[PDB]
Protein backbone atom coordinates (compact mmCIF):
# COMPACT_ATOMS: atom_id res chain seq x y z
CA UNK A 504 0.00 0.00 0.00
CA UNK A 505 2.09 3.11 -1.07
CA UNK A 506 1.68 6.80 0.00
CA UNK A 507 2.97 10.35 -0.19
CA UNK A 508 2.97 12.50 2.94
CA UNK A 509 -0.69 12.44 4.20
CA UNK A 510 -2.15 10.60 1.18
CA UNK A 511 -2.39 6.98 0.27
CA UNK A 512 -2.22 5.75 -3.38
CA UNK A 513 -5.11 3.34 -3.65
CA UNK A 514 -5.64 2.33 -7.38
CA UNK A 515 -4.27 2.75 -10.83
CA UNK A 516 -6.50 5.00 -12.96
CA UNK A 517 -4.27 5.17 -16.03
CA UNK A 518 -0.85 4.45 -17.45
CA UNK A 519 1.30 6.27 -20.01
CA UNK A 520 4.75 6.98 -21.43
CA UNK A 521 6.18 8.92 -18.52
CA UNK A 522 4.34 7.14 -15.61
CA UNK A 523 0.83 6.62 -14.24
CA UNK A 524 -2.15 8.24 -12.54
CA UNK A 525 -3.33 7.04 -9.10
CA UNK A 526 -6.45 7.68 -7.03
CA UNK A 527 -5.10 9.45 -3.85
CA UNK A 528 -7.21 9.53 -0.54
CA UNK A 529 -6.24 11.72 2.44
CA UNK A 530 -6.34 9.16 5.39
CA UNK A 531 -7.33 11.97 7.77
CA UNK A 532 -9.77 14.28 5.74
CA UNK A 533 -10.85 11.54 3.33
CA UNK A 534 -10.60 13.98 0.30
CA UNK A 535 -9.91 12.13 -2.93
CA UNK A 536 -7.75 13.54 -5.75
CA UNK A 537 -5.79 12.13 -8.72
CA UNK A 538 -1.98 11.98 -8.64
CA UNK A 539 0.13 11.86 -11.81
CA UNK A 540 3.45 10.15 -11.07
CA UNK A 541 6.39 10.86 -13.42
CA UNK A 542 9.89 9.26 -13.24
CA UNK A 543 12.18 12.27 -13.95
CA UNK A 544 14.93 9.68 -14.82
CA UNK A 545 12.82 7.63 -17.27
CA UNK A 546 12.48 15.74 -19.85
CA UNK A 547 13.04 17.32 -16.43
CA UNK A 548 12.67 20.48 -18.62
CA UNK A 549 9.38 19.18 -19.88
CA UNK A 550 7.76 18.85 -16.47
CA UNK A 551 9.05 22.24 -15.52
CA UNK A 552 7.00 23.60 -18.38
CA UNK A 553 3.92 21.48 -17.77
CA UNK A 554 3.72 22.48 -14.07
CA UNK A 555 4.10 26.08 -14.97
CA UNK A 556 1.17 26.00 -17.44
CA UNK A 557 -0.87 23.87 -14.97
CA UNK A 558 -0.63 26.67 -12.38
CA UNK A 559 -2.28 29.14 -14.76
CA UNK A 560 -5.49 27.05 -15.13
CA UNK A 561 -8.70 28.10 -13.44
CA UNK A 562 -11.92 27.18 -15.29
CA UNK A 563 -14.79 24.75 -14.66
CA UNK A 564 -14.18 22.82 -17.98
CA UNK A 565 -10.37 22.45 -17.39
CA UNK A 566 -8.64 20.01 -14.90
CA UNK A 567 -7.32 21.87 -11.73
CA UNK A 568 -3.76 21.60 -10.41
CA UNK A 569 -3.49 21.52 -6.58
CA UNK A 570 0.34 21.38 -6.15
CA UNK A 571 3.30 19.01 -6.43
CA UNK A 572 6.16 17.27 -4.57
CA UNK A 573 9.55 16.05 -5.92
CA UNK A 574 10.60 13.01 -3.86
CA UNK A 575 14.04 12.09 -5.12
CA UNK A 576 13.60 11.38 -8.85
CA UNK A 577 9.77 11.15 -8.85
CA UNK A 578 7.44 14.12 -9.28
CA UNK A 579 3.90 13.76 -7.87
CA UNK A 580 1.35 16.17 -9.43
CA UNK A 581 -1.81 16.56 -7.43
CA UNK A 582 -4.80 17.24 -9.70
CA UNK A 583 -8.60 17.17 -9.80
CA UNK A 584 -10.25 13.82 -9.88
CA UNK A 585 -12.78 13.22 -12.74
CA UNK A 586 -14.75 10.28 -11.37
CA UNK A 587 -16.87 9.74 -14.44
CA UNK A 588 -13.83 8.70 -16.44
CA UNK A 589 -13.33 9.64 -20.18
CA UNK A 590 -15.57 10.79 -23.02
CA UNK A 591 -13.99 7.96 -25.06
CA UNK A 592 -15.86 5.44 -22.88
CA UNK A 593 -19.30 7.18 -23.64
CA UNK A 594 -18.95 6.69 -27.41
CA UNK A 595 -20.64 3.48 -28.71
CA UNK A 596 -18.62 2.13 -31.70
CA UNK A 597 -20.36 2.65 -35.03
CA UNK A 598 -23.23 4.51 -33.28
CA UNK A 599 -21.93 7.56 -31.35
CA UNK A 600 -24.33 8.87 -28.66
CA UNK A 601 -27.67 10.76 -28.54
CA UNK A 602 -27.43 14.15 -30.35
CA UNK A 603 -28.56 16.18 -27.28
CA UNK A 604 -25.72 14.63 -25.14
CA UNK A 605 -23.19 15.35 -27.98
CA UNK A 606 -24.40 18.99 -28.23
CA UNK A 607 -24.01 19.50 -24.43
CA UNK A 608 -20.44 18.06 -24.41
CA UNK A 609 -19.61 20.23 -27.50
CA UNK A 610 -20.80 23.39 -25.68
CA UNK A 611 -18.65 22.49 -22.67
CA UNK A 612 -15.58 21.77 -24.86
CA UNK A 613 -15.93 25.16 -26.59
CA UNK A 614 -16.14 26.88 -23.20
CA UNK A 615 -12.87 25.25 -22.07
CA UNK A 616 -11.07 25.98 -25.39
CA UNK A 617 -12.17 29.67 -25.43
CA UNK A 618 -10.77 29.89 -21.83
CA UNK A 619 -7.37 28.43 -22.84
CA UNK A 620 -7.08 30.51 -25.98
CA UNK A 621 -7.97 33.67 -23.97
CA UNK A 622 -4.87 33.06 -21.65
CA UNK A 623 -2.66 32.33 -24.71
CA UNK A 624 -2.37 28.56 -24.16
CA UNK A 625 -2.94 25.86 -26.87
CA UNK A 626 -3.56 22.22 -25.77
CA UNK A 627 -2.34 20.55 -29.06
CA UNK A 628 -3.86 17.08 -28.39
CA UNK A 629 -7.62 17.36 -28.05
CA UNK A 630 -9.33 13.90 -28.39
CA UNK A 631 -11.85 11.83 -26.38
CA UNK A 632 -9.21 10.15 -24.18
CA UNK A 633 -8.16 13.67 -22.96
CA UNK A 634 -11.71 14.87 -22.23
CA UNK A 635 -12.72 13.66 -18.73
CA UNK A 636 -16.05 13.72 -16.86
CA UNK A 637 -16.96 14.66 -13.20
CA UNK A 638 -19.78 12.99 -11.24
CA UNK A 639 -22.41 15.19 -12.90
CA UNK A 640 -21.02 14.47 -16.48
CA UNK A 641 -19.37 17.92 -16.77
CA UNK A 642 -16.44 17.86 -19.25
CA UNK A 643 -12.88 18.61 -18.21
CA UNK A 644 -9.96 19.16 -20.66
CA UNK A 645 -6.94 17.15 -19.31
CA UNK A 646 -3.29 16.13 -20.07
CA UNK A 647 -1.19 19.35 -20.53
CA UNK A 648 2.03 17.49 -21.46
CA UNK A 649 2.02 18.85 -25.04
CA UNK A 650 0.49 22.30 -24.20
CA UNK A 651 2.43 25.52 -25.13
CA UNK A 652 2.20 29.34 -25.17
CA UNK A 653 1.08 30.86 -28.43
CA UNK A 654 0.34 34.51 -27.27
CA UNK A 655 2.44 36.45 -24.74
CA UNK A 656 2.27 40.26 -24.02
CA UNK A 657 -0.46 40.36 -26.59
CA UNK A 658 1.84 39.19 -29.34
CA UNK A 659 1.10 35.86 -31.25
CA UNK A 660 3.90 33.33 -32.02
CA UNK A 661 3.39 30.78 -34.84
CA UNK A 662 4.04 27.13 -34.11
CA UNK A 663 6.30 24.70 -35.92
CA UNK A 664 6.60 21.51 -33.89
CA UNK A 665 4.73 18.39 -35.17
CA UNK A 666 2.67 16.92 -32.38
CA UNK A 667 -0.69 15.49 -31.50
CA UNK A 668 -2.56 12.35 -32.74
CA UNK A 669 -2.78 11.73 -36.51
CA UNK A 670 -6.53 11.15 -36.94
CA UNK A 671 -7.20 14.44 -34.98
CA UNK A 672 -4.42 16.60 -36.44
CA UNK A 673 -5.13 19.47 -38.88
CA UNK A 674 -3.80 19.28 -42.51
CA UNK A 675 -1.57 22.40 -42.18
CA UNK A 676 0.43 20.74 -39.51
CA UNK A 677 1.52 18.13 -42.10
CA UNK A 678 2.00 20.67 -45.07
CA UNK A 679 3.32 23.98 -43.59
CA UNK A 680 6.56 24.97 -42.03
CA UNK A 681 4.82 27.28 -39.51
CA UNK A 682 1.10 27.61 -38.58
CA UNK A 683 -1.31 29.39 -36.26
CA UNK A 684 -2.30 27.58 -33.05
CA UNK A 685 -6.06 28.33 -32.75
CA UNK A 686 -7.34 26.81 -36.06
CA UNK A 687 -5.46 23.51 -35.20
CA UNK A 688 -7.45 23.11 -31.86
CA UNK A 689 -10.64 24.06 -33.69
CA UNK A 690 -10.06 21.21 -36.26
CA UNK A 691 -9.48 18.60 -33.51
CA UNK A 692 -12.79 19.68 -31.85
CA UNK A 693 -14.50 19.00 -35.24
CA UNK A 694 -13.06 15.42 -35.29
CA UNK A 695 -14.33 14.94 -31.67
CA UNK A 696 -17.78 16.06 -32.77
CA UNK A 697 -17.76 13.57 -35.70
CA UNK A 698 -16.73 10.77 -33.21
CA UNK A 699 -19.57 11.61 -30.86
CA UNK A 700 -22.24 11.68 -33.61
CA UNK A 701 -21.03 8.61 -35.71
CA UNK A 702 -18.91 6.41 -33.38
CA UNK A 703 -16.22 6.35 -36.13
CA UNK A 704 -13.25 8.50 -37.21
CA UNK A 705 -13.41 9.76 -40.85
CA UNK A 706 -9.73 9.21 -41.90
CA UNK A 707 -6.35 7.96 -40.80
CA UNK A 708 -4.86 11.43 -41.52
CA UNK A 709 -5.75 14.47 -43.45
CA UNK A 710 -3.31 14.05 -46.37
CA UNK A 711 -3.78 14.15 -50.20
CA UNK A 712 -2.78 10.48 -50.32
CA UNK A 713 -5.65 9.42 -47.95
CA UNK A 714 -8.71 8.41 -50.05
CA UNK A 715 -11.24 9.07 -47.16
CA UNK A 716 -9.89 12.66 -46.87
CA UNK A 717 -10.16 13.15 -50.67
CA UNK A 718 -13.68 11.88 -50.64
CA UNK A 719 -14.66 14.60 -48.06
CA UNK A 720 -12.99 17.38 -50.04
CA UNK A 721 -15.05 16.10 -53.05
CA UNK A 722 -18.24 16.32 -50.86
CA UNK A 723 -19.20 12.68 -51.01
CA UNK A 724 -21.35 12.83 -47.90
CA UNK A 725 -23.35 9.75 -48.88
CA UNK A 726 -20.43 7.81 -47.54
CA UNK A 727 -19.77 6.87 -43.82
CA UNK A 728 -19.35 8.52 -41.30
CA UNK A 729 -21.17 11.47 -42.81
CA UNK A 730 -24.33 9.64 -43.88
CA UNK A 731 -25.03 8.90 -40.15
CA UNK A 732 -25.09 12.57 -39.14
CA UNK A 733 -28.13 14.83 -39.42
CA UNK A 734 -28.05 17.77 -41.79
CA UNK A 735 -27.86 20.49 -39.16
CA UNK A 736 -24.62 19.23 -37.35
CA UNK A 737 -23.20 18.17 -40.74
CA UNK A 738 -23.50 21.78 -41.90
CA UNK A 739 -21.33 22.90 -38.90
CA UNK A 740 -18.74 20.13 -39.70
CA UNK A 741 -18.56 21.49 -43.29
CA UNK A 742 -17.43 24.91 -41.77
CA UNK A 743 -14.92 23.37 -39.27
CA UNK A 744 -13.17 20.71 -41.37
CA UNK A 745 -12.05 23.34 -44.12
CA UNK A 746 -8.52 22.67 -45.44
CA UNK A 747 -7.28 26.27 -45.62
CA UNK A 748 -6.87 27.41 -41.95
CA UNK A 749 -7.55 31.05 -42.86
CA UNK A 750 -10.98 30.15 -44.44
CA UNK A 751 -11.86 27.80 -41.43
CA UNK A 752 -14.60 28.90 -39.04
CA UNK A 753 -13.50 30.63 -35.76
CA UNK A 754 -14.99 30.00 -32.35
CA UNK A 755 -17.02 33.29 -32.23
CA UNK A 756 -18.65 32.16 -35.58
CA UNK A 757 -19.25 28.55 -34.21
CA UNK A 758 -21.31 30.23 -31.44
CA UNK A 759 -23.58 31.74 -34.20
CA UNK A 760 -24.26 28.35 -35.92
CA UNK A 761 -27.79 27.05 -36.33
CA UNK A 762 -27.18 23.59 -34.82
CA UNK A 763 -25.00 25.02 -32.00
CA UNK A 764 -28.06 27.10 -30.97
CA UNK A 765 -30.83 24.39 -31.55
CA UNK A 766 -32.83 23.42 -28.54
CA UNK A 767 -32.51 19.64 -27.99
CA UNK A 768 -33.81 16.98 -25.41
Ligand SMILES: COc1cc(C(=O)N2CCC(N3CCN(C)CC3)CC2)ccc1Nc1ncc2c(n1)N(C)c1ccccc1C(=O)N2C
Nearest residue numbers: 516517524537582583584585586587588589632633645646
Ligand atom coordinates in the same frame (compact mmCIF):
# COMPACT_ATOMS: atom_id res chain seq x y z
C1 LIG B 1 -12.51 7.48 -10.64
O1 LIG B 1 -11.71 8.31 -11.64
C2 LIG B 1 -11.49 7.71 -12.85
C3 LIG B 1 -11.99 6.48 -13.22
C4 LIG B 1 -11.71 5.89 -14.43
C5 LIG B 1 -12.39 4.57 -14.76
O2 LIG B 1 -11.66 3.60 -15.00
N1 LIG B 1 -13.82 4.53 -14.65
C6 LIG B 1 -14.57 3.20 -14.82
C7 LIG B 1 -16.11 3.43 -15.16
C8 LIG B 1 -16.65 4.55 -14.28
N2 LIG B 1 -18.18 4.69 -14.30
C9 LIG B 1 -18.67 5.79 -15.16
C10 LIG B 1 -20.14 6.05 -14.81
N3 LIG B 1 -20.95 4.81 -15.02
C11 LIG B 1 -22.37 5.05 -14.64
C12 LIG B 1 -20.40 3.65 -14.24
C13 LIG B 1 -18.91 3.44 -14.60
C14 LIG B 1 -16.00 5.79 -14.66
C15 LIG B 1 -14.58 5.77 -14.15
C16 LIG B 1 -10.87 6.58 -15.32
C17 LIG B 1 -10.33 7.81 -14.94
C18 LIG B 1 -10.64 8.44 -13.70
N4 LIG B 1 -10.25 9.71 -13.24
C19 LIG B 1 -9.22 10.48 -13.62
N5 LIG B 1 -9.16 11.70 -13.15
C20 LIG B 1 -8.08 12.50 -13.49
C21 LIG B 1 -7.07 12.06 -14.34
C22 LIG B 1 -7.23 10.74 -14.84
N6 LIG B 1 -8.24 9.97 -14.49
N7 LIG B 1 -6.40 10.16 -15.75
C23 LIG B 1 -6.22 8.75 -15.82
C24 LIG B 1 -6.16 10.90 -16.99
C25 LIG B 1 -6.41 10.17 -18.17
C26 LIG B 1 -6.26 10.91 -19.37
C27 LIG B 1 -5.76 12.17 -19.37
C28 LIG B 1 -5.50 12.91 -18.22
C29 LIG B 1 -5.66 12.20 -17.01
C30 LIG B 1 -5.30 12.98 -15.78
O3 LIG B 1 -4.40 13.79 -15.90
N8 LIG B 1 -6.01 12.84 -14.57
C31 LIG B 1 -5.58 13.83 -13.56
